[PDB]
Design a protein around this ligand. Structure first.
Ligand SMILES: C[C@H](Nc1ccc2ncc(CO)cc2c1)C(=O)Nc1ccc(Cl)c(N2CCOCC2)c1
Ligand SMILES: C[C@H](Nc1ccc2ncc(CO)cc2c1)C(=O)Nc1ccc(Cl)c(N2CCOCC2)c1
Ligand SMILES: C[C@H](Nc1ccc2ncc(CO)cc2c1)C(=O)Nc1ccc(Cl)c(N2CCOCC2)c1
Ligand SMILES: C[C@H](Nc1ccc2ncc(CO)cc2c1)C(=O)Nc1ccc(Cl)c(N2CCOCC2)c1
Ligand SMILES: C[C@H](Nc1ccc2ncc(CO)cc2c1)C(=O)Nc1ccc(Cl)c(N2CCOCC2)c1
Ligand SMILES: O=c1[nH]cnc2c1ncn2[C@@H]1O[C@H](COP(=O)(O)O)[C@@H](O)[C@H]1O
Ligand SMILES: O=c1[nH]cnc2c1ncn2[C@@H]1O[C@H](COP(=O)(O)O)[C@@H](O)[C@H]1O
Ligand SMILES: O=c1[nH]cnc2c1ncn2[C@@H]1O[C@H](COP(=O)(O)O)[C@@H](O)[C@H]1O
Ligand SMILES: O=c1[nH]cnc2c1ncn2[C@@H]1O[C@H](COP(=O)(O)O)[C@@H](O)[C@H]1O
Ligand SMILES: O=c1[nH]cnc2c1ncn2[C@@H]1O[C@H](COP(=O)(O)O)[C@@H](O)[C@H]1O
Lengths: 335, 335, 335, 335, 335
């Protein structure tokens, strides 16, 4: 007999309801926690992608109150040099996300392969704030044990495990010692996992499954499928503490890559980390072009401003009020 | 755990069912109440928008049996002059909606800002029939107290509060002393609140939630998302006493703005009050062009004719029969 | 509170299930009943529309085993002349649908207006087999009393009442003396009733509601929304005894109207009876062009062959097996 | 051997060149002659079409300084009543085009059929200023003979002959006694003559051929294919004294027909006089809808405004300067 | 150095000019000559294609005043049976094209291959009026020689040679003893000769080149690229005596093939004789579907109707007037 666990929901399936409010959007607090030890000034995290985050994006992310996760599609020395570049950065930004030493915060992605022990050690030595054990399947023994290894061998660094879509996976990573979990199997804009493997979990239900199991022991990063500022609000309302974006920050001035002149117009490359180009396993991501967006600051302010509006509508003065008091309605295909 | 209050319905999710009928559409009464003290001859209200209602539209609305709500995107003196222009209007219209003095009825929108006490006083002095405390979030303390203030300081004028989408919001505005509530968070044709804030309530469920809580103590204006005369029928069947329209009356002769010649065709501007242009908070509305529709009288007659048809099908001799006896079916994406 | 009677289904919402079968499509019987007194050799009826059925179509319909319903958009004498043209027709067709006198069967539509008593009398005198009291709202006192009048004053003729969409309406027409009921409020291809009045009932649920109330006391004609032969099979499986088609027979050689040369291609006019053109109440139908289809015989054979296939799949040797033993599955938007 | 008379040009093939100018657009004179005896204040004439000109359009045309040509698709009495309606019209318009008696000027179309002698007599008696012998082929002996008959029998009325496209045709009508010639075989927006008969003459070359042969003995009306104000200027520069428009004035308030609601948008019918609908010979015109344009006055002012600019660019103080001193360039498909 | 013989023109490059006229379209004569010995009542010939002409089409063609050319994509006995079927046909058509014996006229196509001598003999014995030596290249030695053989061995039959596009080719076929010459290299709707071989001649220039060389010694059939009745007028004006059509008669009831139901609509197959399907050399034709057009008689009457109109415009009382006196204008891409 067929095991249908639930009818799973995505961002477009739901709407947040307005509630009694004494807070104006301009006055809400966007401060949240990335991990149990790291706090951010905005709930935004830039994706660990070779077309989204390198030192330039990580600096801009940290200056705006968030954090950048440096991609792992570079050799250990190149990646350690990128961590140092952010940690040693000095400006000529009051909401800057900084460590105890007043340096800009940064994260770096690691895999589970042979190079991981050397990669983790080089990144910790360079002063990385958080190690992200970055995979397509966080509910594997390789990820769970690598998370345990990072925590036991480098307790001075925060560790994130992903990607997950269920509460069982969250509990496994919590028991291993993760300081946060990254949620998202199938919601990515460049994701073909659903087509290739027939695997996935609609993001609102993934956030819910994970947040319900964790019971706020560790925060969760809602990773993938964010298209509008409304999706960020819905993700936080569903239980997320932070939001990871790829697409929205791709195309910006601070993102890696040069601007290309295609059909008169200006673009930047955007590709999945499991795409043919990025891998050089069957590909699980697509390669494409995104329009040139200019400085990332504008996109970030547009997105945060929409989140402030939502918190104004829901009567959420702080991120934690949205996370605890959000009420939703399920909408149909017509809505 | 995720709080899904209900599966919320919009106009396209439902159809009214035909019932035993002894009334022909030509003989149905379209008389209804705008507020607990103001009655209309047709359940139509023109939107408080700088591209929909100024004195010209308000006069045409009142002559046709409805009412116009003058927009607040003008200074106190300009708005008071517009109220007087409607109140002093004399023709060279048997269904005219008039006050005790035989003058055409008019409404005016007010905000919650510093200018509101002076604005209310100037509008009441000019002879305004109804003050509309017109905001994006009526369930805010600011709107509730402004509603309370208008009622206590100017009992001689009727007051509406909004916009709302829940029964709790309705009860809070009823307790403050509102004479009617305006329903609509997200259904507007030019609305981007759902995209920007991820906030909203499908209109049939919004009307239902509000009407069920009010228990006919005060009427509700179903504001936004009306595209056809069938939506009006469905809105009244769901519990609305009146319907507010922006889109349908935009592009008409009586609406503000000059006709523009674009690619042969004739157009008029139509924009949200929370759009970039209208504000000059992140924008929550779009700016656009609507085709030129000629005299508003033609659109009004087409809309009321369709509503008369629906009342004929449901055996509704008066507006109150449709509100109390309407039976619906939920339809799927295929329907 | 909102009264949602049910989630109503249309043709596209369901699929018939294959069952154990000892019958090949070539051997199935398509014989059914139009009214409790009139039997057809095929469950097909041509619509009472000025672009679908006049004497030419009614002759071709009767020769193929079905029946034509002559439209009422012509004067009493013109309509009576048309009935005679079919009653006096002699060929130079073994499945012909004929009366006791061996003459081809025909029906004629009547309204409820002042001319109805004279129209009914002229049609009965010309040898009409069935009077169809054709309207948009069968559940109106006007139709129930006109149906009762036709039965009491002309018991020698069969009478159909409609259009209806509910069981309550069917019982009212049954008590009035109708020999059959016509089902369809909103499914028509040229119907704008759902848009104009917000009134309607998805056809599978309309057939079901009516058939369940009638308990086979009188047959029902499933009228409107038939696009494919599978829709017919679905309609019969849901409880229909016959199917009425407009658009499928529009554009055929036999249908009224001349062929028009438009952008190389050949077309015929097809319009709703409640469209602007047909009326000359707000219009509830659209006017259009349908491609030239050639002799109607081909369309009829393609449609009947599909129903034979379906009956082969369901193990239905006779029409009554499909009506009694059909099992369905509800499908989603993806299906 | 193939006789190619010339490479013939349409409006889009040419552009007028700017010249030394001392007269501003606001100060130019748009006064011109319709016939050798009739002068207009603007070079605009409304088409003799049942979807363009009846008394309402003819009055509005004359008030704006132009003239209307009443269509012949009505009985002699109906047409004579339309002439009188214009001649007897009194306002509650300084550029009004009036006769010696101060009455608004009007024209009426006639054919070559049996009713023509009675038609001409009734129109002359009704006070028509100009008889237009209105056909698809003015170079036919029938039209030349009817033009001669009107001039010899009714010298007190002005007479126009057409439609023509060559200098030979112009000279034949000039010898027949025509007071003006109407130019246009194939340029019409609803014209299918080029497809049906393979007959036609690109409008700039038609105007040129005719103007060059006439040597200003009688003026020419450039009839058909005017889409913009630029077309008008090019036609006058090529030799036209006036311009006849159908589609530009179709869909205006004053044009015959009611406004129809179709796909939310408002329209009016526009059809060729040789279309199936207008005739009820193979049809040589199409039937369609044009968007509702509102008052004709706006269209007329936009057109004259553009012709004023062209005259300002060419240094044409009067219409005759444009006619005599215009210099063109031939442009390619790329231009 | 590059040899550009001329700038060659197609139908769309030219328009016929109106001229002085004393003839009405209804009174014009459409009588012409197919060959030096065979006269037709209408200048229309149906194409020798397996989707256009078999005995059914050839009978309908001859009854309408034209002639059918039976395709050669059948064995000698099958083709001879088709000739006899037409010759022996007796009706229950005053413009019928008949021989001296009062039998319907017919033509048959032959190739240059081994079976040609036996094929010619069987067709002549069956009473064929004209042998058509049907090829892609009439200027080939094989065709000129087969034409010579048919004339010397069977002087009792008329012989047509083709296809050609130049005057040199016409003179070679005239010296061979051809009674007519078929013109058309590249104009066909299903032709890919221009793409495959880069060979071709725009049809107006092909007709002109051929007619100018022949000096009326033998007539020419303008074969291919006729889309409208205007093309026919242009082809005759350019020097053609008759017109051969494939696409226009494909999809008619009389054309070979069954009607196919595809995406609701009704179609018939239409394919080039040099297409993959027809051959079973690289293919030089495409295979497709054409809409069902109904009886060919309607298409023929609409086509001849438009030709009568053109003759009325050009003052052509007979086909020879249009051939000898036609004057054209070259039009641009804008026209
Ligand atoms: C090609 C694809 N590449 C990518 C790349 C980045 C991705 N990032 C996110 C998501 C979430 O849908 C999928 C992604 C797939 C990828 O990695 N597929 C993939 C498929 C199945 C498993 Cl079990 C694993 N795992 C191996 C054991 O260790 C855990 C991983 C990996
Ligand atoms: C820019 C947008 N502007 C508009 C403009 C017109 C609108 N009209 C209707 C709706 C309903 O969707 C939304 C609209 C948004 C707007 O006003 N957003 C907005 C967002 C959140 C809150 Cl709490 C408030 N409130 C502040 C406290 O006082 C109550 C309001 C207002
Ligand atoms: C314009 C439209 N015209 C049409 C025309 C043909 C139709 N045929 C079928 C259907 C089913 O949707 C609707 C149609 C509407 C039409 O007739 N609307 C209409 C609307 C409401 C009512 Cl109570 C009635 N009734 C009057 C009392 O007597 C019963 C009728 C009729
Ligand atoms: C059906 C078409 N109808 C129309 C109607 C209006 C038109 N108005 C303008 C133009 C210009 O292309 C063509 C039009 C064709 C039309 O009249 N064709 C037409 C074709 C050929 C000729 Cl000899 C004549 N003539 C008959 C003798 O008397 C002179 C006319 C007329
Ligand atoms: C495949 C194509 N088939 C067709 C079929 C029918 C056609 N019918 C007409 C036209 C005119 O463009 C082209 C066609 C090409 C075809 O026959 N091409 C073709 C190409 C070149 C030459 Cl010399 C010959 N010739 C061989 C010597 O004998 C003379 C012919 C034939
Ligand atoms: O190739 C890939 N396949 C599937 N998901 C991917 C791939 N590369 C990155 N992702 C995920 O997609 C996210 C970006 O999603 P987006 O913001 O919707 O564009 C990243 O943070 C990853 O979790
Ligand atoms: O900028 C805006 N954002 C969202 N809703 C708006 C905005 N401006 C006006 N509205 C609402 O939209 C209604 C008009 O909706 P419509 O009739 O669907 O066009 C107004 O009466 C307001 O309630
Ligand atoms: O104007 C109209 N409005 C709505 N329904 C119509 C109208 N005219 C006819 N109908 C219905 O539509 C049916 C034809 O539906 P169809 O087969 O889907 O085209 C007719 O038999 C009538 O019941
Ligand atoms: O049926 C028709 N066929 C061709 N030309 C027509 C027909 N009816 C009117 N016309 C011409 O088209 C002109 C209008 O052209 P338009 O301004 O381009 O729409 C009229 O003044 C007539 O000269
Ligand atoms: O395969 C082919 N290639 C090129 N021309 C063809 C082919 N088959 C037939 N034709 C020609 O195309 C003509 C039909 O042209 P149509 O009337 O434009 O469709 C025939 O009479 C042949 O001369």
């Amino acid at each position: 007999m067929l095991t249908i666990v639930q009818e799973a929901l995505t961002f477009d399936d739901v709407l947040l309801l307005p509630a009694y409010s004494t807070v104006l959007p301009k006055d809400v607090s966007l401060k949240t926690r990335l991990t149990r030890g790291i706090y951010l000034n905005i709930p935004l995290v830039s994706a660990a992608m070779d077309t989204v985050t390198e030192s330039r994006m990580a600096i801009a992310m940290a200056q705006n109150g968030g954090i950048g996760i440096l991609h792992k599609n570079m050799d250990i020395a190149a990646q350690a040099a990128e961590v140092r570049r952010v940690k040693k950065f000095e400006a000529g930004y009051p909401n800057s996300c900084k460590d105890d030493l007043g340096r800009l915060r940064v994260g770096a992605a690691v895999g589970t392969g042979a190079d991981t022990p050397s990669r983790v050690e080089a990144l910790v030595e360079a002063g990385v704030d958080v190690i992200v054990v970055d995979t397509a399947h966080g509910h594997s023994a390789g990820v769970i044990e690598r998370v345990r290894w990072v925590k036991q061998n480098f307790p001075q660094v925060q560790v994130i495990g992903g990607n997950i879509a269920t509460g069982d996976a969250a509990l496994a990573l919590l028991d291993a010692g993760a300081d946060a979990v990254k949620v998202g199997i199938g919601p990515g804009s460049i994701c073909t996992t659903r087509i290739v493997a027939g695997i996935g979990m609609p993001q609102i239900s993934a956030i819910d499954s994970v947040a319900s199991a964790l019971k706020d022991q560790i925060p969760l990063i809602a990773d993938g499928g964010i298209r509008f500022s409304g999706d960020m609000a819905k993700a936080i309302g569903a239980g997320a503490s932070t939001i990871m974006v790829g697409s929205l920050l791709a195309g910006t001035e601070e993102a890696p890559g040069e601007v290309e002149f295609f059909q008169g117009r200006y673009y930047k490359a955007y590709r999945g980390m499991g795409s043919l180009g990025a891998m050089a396993l069957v590909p699980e991501g697509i390669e494409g072009r995104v329009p040139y967006k200019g400085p990332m600051g504008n996109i970030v302010h547009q997105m945060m401003g929409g989140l402030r509006s939502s918190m104004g509508y829901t009567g959420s003065a702080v991120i934690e009020d949205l996370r605890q008091n959000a009420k939703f309605v399920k909408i149909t295909s017509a809505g």
